[PDB]
Design a protein around this ligand. Structure first.
Ligand SMILES: Cc1cc2nc3c(=O)[nH]c(=O)nc-3n(C[C@H](O)[C@H](O)[C@H](O)COP(=O)(O)OP(=O)(O)OC[C@H]3O[C@@H](n4cnc5c(N)ncnc54)[C@H](O)[C@@H]3O)c2cc1C
Ligand SMILES: Cc1cc2nc3c(=O)[nH]c(=O)nc-3n(C[C@H](O)[C@H](O)[C@H](O)COP(=O)(O)OP(=O)(O)OC[C@H]3O[C@@H](n4cnc5c(N)ncnc54)[C@H](O)[C@@H]3O)c2cc1C
Lengths: 259, 253
């Protein structure tokens, strides 16, 4: 599974904060259509939180927690939902889905996207080559999760930039789907250490090749992270300042102790 | 300039056909929203084929008021004449067989336009090239299908950002040049991704013919995935387009 490091536990806590803030909104859903959309996302978010923790999605326990948050008092004040959330969560033995910190920043959102990426890379590396059925389904859920990233926070240019470029991320998830599918039909995945080797092996005329960068999604999501911060200087019409430092792959791997 | 080749000629005609079929839906629009968007797309589309900006402005205002009641072969006839009335024979498609290939050809044609504009940029008119890049993203964000394939549109709307991301790379590259560092053009995608793996803004590497490579790769991806979409293994005669081959077909250097 995934290396335990300080950053990864910030990711894990940020991710539960993001989930908690998305079920909070359930209360306020004036829209039938918005309620169902949030129900599915909250379902899926806690599915992947329980999966890594209990080794089981707990479909009927999280199903309870959703009913609750939709049928919750839609006239709370911040903590007026938090309090009973802890009260609800523990009656379902889901306390390990309670966030420790509640300060919701842009890094809550980044941490959550990086978190899901590490889950995809882990699910793929620890795949049993029989229930490819399982992993391939989760990848589909992951695309659905990255497609509907709620900001909760209000930043309209962030929201419109992402809708324009998020397909960069979803594209690489689908690369993995092609890789798992090629393995189901007898061509094992050849894991490679560089994104550039995966680029080189994609440029073939036949379908018989199957290379995939190890920790693809950690690399994709970080490159994407750099890209958003690269581009914000254009939206702001400034030269990138000297204080601006970009994440390099080798340093990112070091911080999360990836091999 | 873009090399004149058989494939490139087919691209330009497919592009006119796509633009023709786009304005054919102006007369059918029952929405102020959709008329504005269709007209934006059209203005951009013909702008990138041409300036005759007033002859086009009224080719479109003609397309808005054309008879809703016509069949397609009639609108064509009326369009084939308003174009000649307008000194715009160059916008007339030669074929009208509209297929998935017409859409792909249109996406590849816009890609060659991006690469050409960037490579023949002028270090003083970067403000112009960067405003063109913003128009392109709108064209790519808004790919109408005309023909109906709901999974095609659902899929495109999920991964179209792969293409738009790479347009935004070029913008980033041009901004590092407005501020002092000239673009270096590299011959492989690998080098460009290696040059972006730096902590400090010292590099400005761009793949030459990047958007052609990007649009080719993305085209292969769509076809790669259609076999998964059909619980199937791809036929033995399926052949992915390779980069060396694609440059050979368009005489790219
Ligand atoms: C989907 C999304 C879209 C956004 N779109 C825009 C936009 O369009 N315009 C705009 O101005 N802002 C946008 N933002 C916010 C922007 O990215 C930054 O969050 C903010 O502008 C600056 O915050 P910061 O200086 O703390 O850097 P941050 O990137 O927020 O730092 C947060 C954490 O991430 C670490 N980190 C930095 N880079 C990486 C990396 N490549 N990979 C992994 N970790 C990294 C940092 O060291 C730190 O731990 C977006 C954010 C998200 C999540
Ligand atoms: C945006 C878009 C999205 C689509 N999404 C789907 C989908 O989700 N599911 C589905 O089943 N179909 C989808 N299609 C249609 C699909 O891509 C094929 O076009 C279709 O299946 C017809 O098969 P074909 O072999 O005749 O087309 P193609 O093989 O794609 O024919 C296009 C022409 O251009 C050439 N060409 C082929 N590949 C490339 C390449 N990688 N780069 C440059 N040139 C190339 C070929 O020589 C051919 O002449 C999509 C099409 C478009 C334009």
């Amino acid at each position: 599974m995934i290396p335990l490091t300080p950053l990864f536990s910030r990711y894990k806590d940020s991710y539960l904060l993001y989930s908690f803030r998305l079920i909070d909104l359930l209360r306020a859903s004036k829209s039938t259509h918005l309620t169902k959309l949030l129900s599915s996302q909250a379902t899926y978010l806690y599915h992947f939180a329980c999966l890594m923790k209990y080794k089981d999605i707990q479909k009927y326990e999280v199903q309870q927690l959703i009913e609750w948050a939709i049928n919750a008092s839609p006239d709370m004040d911040l903590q007026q939902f938090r309090i009973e959330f802890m009260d609800k969560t523990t009656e379902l033995n889901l306390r390990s889905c309670q966030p420790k910190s509640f300060t919701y920043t842009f890094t809550t959102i980044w941490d959550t996207m990086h978190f899901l990426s590490l889950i995809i890379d882990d699910m793929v590396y620890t795949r049993d080559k029989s229930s490819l059925d399982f992993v391939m389904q989760q990848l589909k859920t992951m695309k659905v999760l990255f497609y509907n990233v709620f900001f909760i926070l209000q930043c309209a240019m962030c929201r419109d930039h992402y809708m324009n470029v998020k397909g960069f991320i979803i594209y690489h998830i689908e690369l993995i789907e092609i890789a798992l599918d090629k393995e189901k039909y007898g061509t094992d995945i050849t894991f490679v250490d560089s994104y550039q080797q995966e680029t080189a092996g994609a440029d073939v005329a036949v379908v018989s090749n199957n290379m995939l960068m190890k920790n693809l999604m950690a690399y994709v999501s970080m490159t994407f992270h750099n890209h958003i911060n690269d581009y914000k200087w254009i939206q702001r019409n400034k030269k990138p300042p000297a204080h601006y430092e970009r994440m390099t792959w080798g340093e990112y791997k070091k911080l999360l102790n990836l091999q």
